[PDB]
Enzyme design. Structure first.
Site, PDB file in Angstrom:
ATOM      1  N   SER A   1     -12.519  64.977  27.384  1.00  0.00           N
ATOM      2  CA  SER A   1     -13.489  64.594  26.368  1.00  0.00           C
ATOM      3  C   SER A   1     -12.796  63.868  25.223  1.00  0.00           C
ATOM      4  O   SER A   1     -11.830  64.377  24.651  1.00  0.00           O
ATOM      5  CB  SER A   1     -14.216  65.834  25.853  1.00  0.00           C
ATOM      6  OG  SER A   1     -15.151  65.504  24.844  1.00  0.00           O
ATOM      7  N   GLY A   2     -13.300  62.690  24.869  1.00  0.00           N
ATOM      8  CA  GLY A   2     -12.658  61.909  23.833  1.00  0.00           C
ATOM      9  C   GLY A   2     -11.621  60.921  24.304  1.00  0.00           C
ATOM     10  O   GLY A   2     -10.937  60.326  23.465  1.00  0.00           O
TER      11      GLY A   2
ATOM     12  N   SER B   1     -19.681  62.214  22.279  1.00  0.00           N
ATOM     13  CA  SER B   1     -19.476  62.920  23.542  1.00  0.00           C
ATOM     14  C   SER B   1     -20.716  62.901  24.424  1.00  0.00           C
ATOM     15  O   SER B   1     -21.791  63.336  24.016  1.00  0.00           O
ATOM     16  CB  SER B   1     -19.076  64.358  23.253  1.00  0.00           C
ATOM     17  OG  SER B   1     -20.223  65.142  23.003  1.00  0.00           O
ATOM     18  N   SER B   2     -20.537  62.427  25.652  1.00  0.00           N
ATOM     19  CA  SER B   2     -21.635  62.125  26.569  1.00  0.00           C
ATOM     20  C   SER B   2     -21.930  63.305  27.481  1.00  0.00           C
ATOM     21  O   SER B   2     -21.350  63.444  28.554  1.00  0.00           O
ATOM     22  CB  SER B   2     -21.322  60.876  27.382  1.00  0.00           C
ATOM     23  OG  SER B   2     -20.032  60.944  27.957  1.00  0.00           O
TER      24      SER B   2
ATOM     25  N   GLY C   1     -16.133  64.903  30.451  1.00  0.00           N
ATOM     26  CA  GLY C   1     -14.718  65.219  30.471  1.00  0.00           C
ATOM     27  C   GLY C   1     -14.449  66.703  30.359  1.00  0.00           C
ATOM     28  O   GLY C   1     -15.328  67.479  30.026  1.00  0.00           O
TER      29      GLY C   1
ATOM     30  N   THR D   1     -16.549  56.706  28.682  1.00  0.00           N
ATOM     31  CA  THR D   1     -17.841  56.058  28.473  1.00  0.00           C
ATOM     32  C   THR D   1     -17.701  54.572  28.157  1.00  0.00           C
ATOM     33  O   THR D   1     -18.376  53.743  28.775  1.00  0.00           O
ATOM     34  CB  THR D   1     -18.620  56.763  27.365  1.00  0.00           C
ATOM     35  OG1 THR D   1     -18.566  58.181  27.565  1.00  0.00           O
ATOM     36  CG2 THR D   1     -20.064  56.313  27.365  1.00  0.00           C
TER      37      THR D   1
ATOM     38  N   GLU E   1     -13.312  70.162  28.982  1.00  0.00           N
ATOM     39  CA  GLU E   1     -13.641  70.666  27.652  1.00  0.00           C
ATOM     40  C   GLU E   1     -13.050  72.043  27.428  1.00  0.00           C
ATOM     41  O   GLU E   1     -13.050  72.881  28.333  1.00  0.00           O
ATOM     42  CB  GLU E   1     -15.147  70.799  27.437  1.00  0.00           C
ATOM     43  CG  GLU E   1     -15.987  69.646  27.843  1.00  0.00           C
ATOM     44  CD  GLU E   1     -17.408  69.776  27.384  1.00  0.00           C
ATOM     45  OE1 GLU E   1     -18.046  70.783  27.738  1.00  0.00           O
ATOM     46  OE2 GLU E   1     -17.892  68.874  26.677  1.00  0.00           O
TER      47      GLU E   1
ATOM     48  N   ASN F   1     -15.426  64.830  20.291  1.00  0.00           N
ATOM     49  CA  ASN F   1     -15.783  63.416  20.256  1.00  0.00           C
ATOM     50  C   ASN F   1     -17.153  63.254  19.615  1.00  0.00           C
ATOM     51  O   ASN F   1     -18.126  63.861  20.067  1.00  0.00           O
ATOM     52  CB  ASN F   1     -15.809  62.835  21.671  1.00  0.00           C
ATOM     53  CG  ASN F   1     -16.246  61.390  21.709  1.00  0.00           C
ATOM     54  OD1 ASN F   1     -16.183  60.671  20.712  1.00  0.00           O
ATOM     55  ND2 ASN F   1     -16.723  60.962  22.864  1.00  0.00           N
TER      56      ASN F   1
HETATM   57  N1  LIG Z   1     -11.450  51.243  24.288  1.00  0.00           N
HETATM   58  C1  LIG Z   1     -11.692  51.696  23.038  1.00  0.00           C
HETATM   59  N2  LIG Z   1     -11.632  50.883  21.969  1.00  0.00           N
HETATM   60  C2  LIG Z   1     -11.874  51.339  20.729  1.00  0.00           C
HETATM   61  N3  LIG Z   1     -12.191  52.614  20.442  1.00  0.00           N
HETATM   62  C3  LIG Z   1     -12.284  53.539  21.419  1.00  0.00           C
HETATM   63  C4  LIG Z   1     -12.033  53.110  22.798  1.00  0.00           C
HETATM   64  N4  LIG Z   1     -12.169  54.196  23.562  1.00  0.00           N
HETATM   65  C5  LIG Z   1     -12.515  55.227  22.764  1.00  0.00           C
HETATM   66  N5  LIG Z   1     -12.571  54.842  21.477  1.00  0.00           N
HETATM   67  C6  LIG Z   1     -12.881  55.734  20.335  1.00  0.00           C
HETATM   68  O1  LIG Z   1     -13.026  57.060  20.847  1.00  0.00           O
HETATM   69  C7  LIG Z   1     -14.405  57.441  20.840  1.00  0.00           C
HETATM   70  C8  LIG Z   1     -14.759  58.154  22.132  1.00  0.00           C
HETATM   71  O2  LIG Z   1     -15.078  57.209  23.134  1.00  0.00           O
HETATM   72  P1  LIG Z   1     -16.217  57.599  24.192  1.00  0.00           P
HETATM   73  O3  LIG Z   1     -16.861  56.316  24.623  1.00  0.00           O
HETATM   74  O4  LIG Z   1     -17.092  58.643  23.562  1.00  0.00           O
HETATM   75  O5  LIG Z   1     -15.433  58.218  25.451  1.00  0.00           O
HETATM   76  P2  LIG Z   1     -15.751  59.691  26.007  1.00  0.00           P
HETATM   77  O6  LIG Z   1     -17.188  59.620  26.435  1.00  0.00           O
HETATM   78  O7  LIG Z   1     -14.788  59.873  27.148  1.00  0.00           O
HETATM   79  O8  LIG Z   1     -15.483  60.613  24.854  1.00  0.00           O
HETATM   80  C9  LIG Z   1     -15.175  56.166  20.597  1.00  0.00           C
HETATM   81  O9  LIG Z   1     -16.384  56.468  19.910  1.00  0.00           O
HETATM   82  C10 LIG Z   1     -14.210  55.476  19.670  1.00  0.00           C
HETATM   83  O10 LIG Z   1     -14.219  56.133  18.405  1.00  0.00           O
HETATM   84 MG   LIG Z   2     -18.111  60.171  28.230  1.00  0.00          MG
END
Ligand SMILES: Nc1ncnc2c1ncn2[C@@H]1O[C@H](COP(=O)(O)OP(=O)(O)O)[C@@H](O)[C@H]1O
Ligand SMILES: [Mg+2]
Length: 764
Positions: free
Chosen positions: A178-179, A228-229, A451, A183, A453, A225
């Site tokens: 997670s984080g 978080s999805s 992810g 996504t 957790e 996060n």
């Molecule tokens: N490729 C990227 N470029 C810029 N920021 C990112 C990137 N990947 C993650 N982040 C930062 O981390 C956060 C979590 O990304 P997220 O899309 O929620 O992935 P997950 O769903 O795995 O947590 C994003 O909101 C952003 O703050």
């Molecule tokens: Mg996700």
């Protein structure tokens, strides 16, 4: 930069400059001295050997501290020409700090993507980068992974080229905590295929806009996060035989439906609830009988209502537009705000015990009156049926007297069920718009499961998410480390099976099998007298000392009470077992559901139409359906690494990333590429593609066995005969040799083209 001119303003974040590519070869370096040594507060440090003391060694670290370490533990640096290398398999030394410090050095100039042979490693930058601009999609089109620098666009492109070449369905499997970035990397993959298809309808945009619709209802701020999805998503993009974008399907495997009514401190509800409020939008908040303050809605007020990261006032407009682009009609779009409005009221309903009768009746009515108007119900029948459910017992129905605690639960159960059925209908609405009926042959399925957790109240909603991770890594471990070693023996390569030590079936057997944890939750739903203390006892008696992965809880001071600890692949998780027996079946009030079936609201009547199967059973069957499907595809992995729990960009914690590298098995995943034979070709295609290299070795029109033809051919190509092997059905190649053939192939063809020009001048 001249070579990097095609990548434009993104070029400083895709390769080091033409200065540094030369200047790095000038670095001061003594191969006898430059080593990594272990350290406790930071897993490895660069060091210079100071002396040899027999089987011990002494050294000076990069921070000047003197260290003495045993000679089996001190371990050489990669020499400086390999600095920031794009595909880490080609290192001269591969070991724990080698992959660590190479990833730190790429991340130390925000080059975030790196290959690891057959897959990729993606560190997370908490800073948006211009490396995703849409011209860079055109720059990446059709290039090989050996040419262009590592990037998510390259892995999608390589998967697309493999699809057209081998005619087999692809899957891109994005994995991490997670984080970590699963996504956004899924969004970037979908962005690539959209923009490629848009250069060469509106499907290309609808598959982009299909995400922010779901991200409103399916994502919520959690401490790990801010976005978080809370649902695992598998996007099947479909392509026609010509390779054009044809259609797409979304599947969404589980939703954390209890978050609608229960939130821990430091967390939000789903985003749709807060972005309805925060925009102050009168076109909603006069239609819904809401007031603009979240703190009086009992389902939404607890935890944290607002965060610095998210500007909900713009995100509302974005998702209201997202439903427009997907084609949600205005009454239907308004209708799902009504239910998402009703759920806010539905927790505010107050109930009180009648003073001697031990039965609960409504303390007031106005909040029920609001909800029944939005849901299209009779308020008098709603509160009656909620406090007096009729349950069928054959020829007679018996009426049960709900005490004040259980009627409150019954509202919670109904609120969860409306939300989860509304969400799952929306996915079915999206898929119906996306089925364009364009012609189709193959698919590319992009997977981002929720992810791994570790919160501080690991309830049942974290066993299902952590079990999904443990299966999907076991899919990776099966694909990279076992099936890759069954193929060698099946084709008769002179190969010895290597024990990589990365296998997890001993822990999945504790969960999945018919006397594992998720089977006991299915037995104890059959007994009316079962209770969670009796359930917990049944676990311990069956599993304590009868599996290694099942341990007694480790209650730390402060941390809430936990009832067992599991040894999951990425960590020891201390689950809390209170209430799982209702969460695994969650039965609705049958009478109130009958009112929802008689609602005037066409949505809500659809949601409960045609309302035996537990939450775990439906989950476990669907998850095994998923990983049956993935086994019939060629997977492209992209590993995602969270570098820092503080969410500040650029700073990286060495022990935290080293824990992720080990448990993702990234080090073993590179070693199998260096040890084994990762590229392999059928002899029919080998004759077809590569006879251009030396046509005189095997003259077509003169018969030869295709196996025997290949055996002649490669011997004449002045290449190292130790780098390839002949199997029964296929030829097998070492890591670099497939590139060597491709480079030799394009070079000879280019020479031929110049001869074609020269003969044309000659005949004239
Ligand atoms: N490729 C990227 N470029 C810029 N920021 C990112 C990137 N990947 C993650 N982040 C930062 O981390 C956060 C979590 O990304 P997220 O899309 O929620 O992935 P997950 O769903 O795995 O947590 C994003 O909101 C952003 O703050
Ligand atoms: Mg996700």
């Amino acid at each position: 930069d001249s070579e990097m001119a095609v990548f434009g303003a993104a070029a400083p974040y895709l390769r080091k400059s033409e200065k540094e590519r030369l200047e790095a070869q000038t670095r001061p370096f003594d191969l006898k001295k430059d080593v990594f040594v272990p350290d406790d507060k930071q897993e490895f440090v660069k060091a210079k050997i100071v002396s040899r003391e027999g089987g011990k060694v002494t050294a000076e670290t990069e921070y000047g501290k003197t260290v003495t370490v045993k000679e089996d533990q001190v371990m050489q640096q990669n020499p400086p020409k390999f600095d920031k290398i794009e595909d880490m398999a080609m290192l001269t030394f591969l070991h724990e700090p080698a992959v660590l410090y190479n990833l730190k050095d790429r991340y130390g100039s925000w080059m975030i993507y790196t290959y690891s042979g057959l897959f990729c490693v993606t560190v997370n930058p908490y800073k948006w980068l211009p490396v995703y601009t849409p011209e860079v999609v055109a720059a990446y089109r059709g290039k090989k992974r050996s040419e262009a620098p590592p990037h998510i666009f390259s892995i999608s492109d390589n998967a697309y080229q493999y699809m057209l070449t081998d005619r087999e369905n692809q899957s891109i499997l994005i994995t991490g905590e997670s984080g970590a970035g699963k996504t956004v990397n899924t969004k970037r993959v979908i962005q690539y295929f959209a923009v490629i298809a848009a250069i060469g309808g509106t499907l290309e945009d609808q598959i982009i806009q299909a995400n922010p619709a779901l991200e409103a209802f399916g994502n919520a701020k959690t401490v790990r996060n801010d976005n978080s999805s809370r649902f695992g998503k598998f996007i099947r993009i479909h392509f026609g035989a010509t390779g054009k974008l044809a259609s797409a399907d979304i599947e969404t495997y589980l939703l954390e439906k209890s978050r609608v009514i229960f939130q821990l401190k430091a967390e939000r509800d789903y985003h749709i609830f807060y972005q309805i409020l925060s925009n102050k939008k009168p076109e909603l908040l006069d239609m819904l009988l809401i007031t603009n303050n979240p703190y009086d809605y009992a389902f939404i007020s607890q935890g944290e209502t607002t965060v610095a990261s998210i500007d909900d006032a713009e995100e509302l407009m974005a998702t209201d537009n997202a439903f427009d682009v997907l084609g949600f009609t205005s009454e239907e779009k308004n209708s799902m705000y009504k239910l998402t409005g009703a759920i806010m009221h539905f927790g505010n309903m107050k109930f009180k015990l009648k003073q001697r009768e031990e039965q609960a009746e409504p303390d007031g009515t106005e909040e029920a009156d609001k909800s029944a108007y939005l849901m299209g119900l009779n308020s008098a029948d709603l509160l009656k049926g909620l406090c007096h459910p009729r349950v069928k017992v054959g020829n007679e129905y018996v009426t049960k007297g709900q005490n004040v605690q259980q009627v409150i639960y019954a509202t919670g159960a109904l609120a969860k069920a409306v939300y989860e059925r509304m969400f799952n209908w929306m996915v079915t609405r999206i898929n119906a718009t996306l089925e364009t009926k364009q012609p189709r042959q193959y698919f590319i399925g992009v997977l981002d499961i929720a992810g791994f957790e570790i919160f501080d109240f690991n309830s049942f909603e974290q066993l299902c998410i952590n079990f999904t991770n443990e299966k999907l890594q076991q899919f990776f471990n099966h694909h990279m480390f076992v099936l890759e070693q069954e193929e060698y023996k099946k084709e008769g390569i002179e190969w010895t099976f290597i024990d990589f030590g990365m296998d997890l079936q001993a822990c999945i057997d504790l969960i999945e099998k018919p006397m594992g944890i998720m089977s006991i939750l299915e037995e104890e739903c059959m007994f009316p007298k079962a209770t969670d203390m009796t359930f917990k006892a049944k676990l311990f008696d069956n599993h304590l000392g009868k599996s290694a992965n099942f341990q007694k809880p480790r209650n730390i001071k402060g941390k809430p009470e936990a009832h067992f600890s599991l040894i999951h692949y990425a960590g020891i998780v201390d689950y809390n077992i209170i209430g799982w027996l209702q969460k695994n079946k969650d039965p609705l009030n049958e009478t109130v559901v009958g009112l929802y079936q008689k609602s005037s609201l066409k949505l809500l009547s659809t949601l409960f139409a045609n309302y035996f199967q537990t939450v775990s059973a439906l989950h476990r069957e669907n998850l095994n359906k998923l990983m049956t499907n993935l086994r019939s595809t060629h997977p492209h992995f992209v590993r995602c690494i969270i570098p820092n729990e503080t969410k500040s960009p650029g700073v990286m914690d060495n022990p935290l990333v080293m824990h992720q590298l080990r448990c993702n098995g990234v080090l073993e995943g590179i070693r199998i590429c260096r040890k084994g034979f990762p590229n392999r070709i059928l002899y029919g295609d080998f004759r077809q593609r590569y006879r251009i290299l030396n046509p005189a070795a095997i003259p077509e029109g003169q018969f030869i066995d295709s196996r025997k033809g290949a055996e002649k051919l490669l011997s004449s190509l002045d290449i190292d005969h130790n780098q390839y092997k002949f199997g029964h059905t296929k030829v097998f190649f070492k890591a670099g040799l497939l590139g060597l053939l491709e480079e030799m192939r394009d070079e000879r063809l280019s020479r031929i083209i110049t001869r074609i020009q020269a003969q044309s001048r000659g005949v004239l």
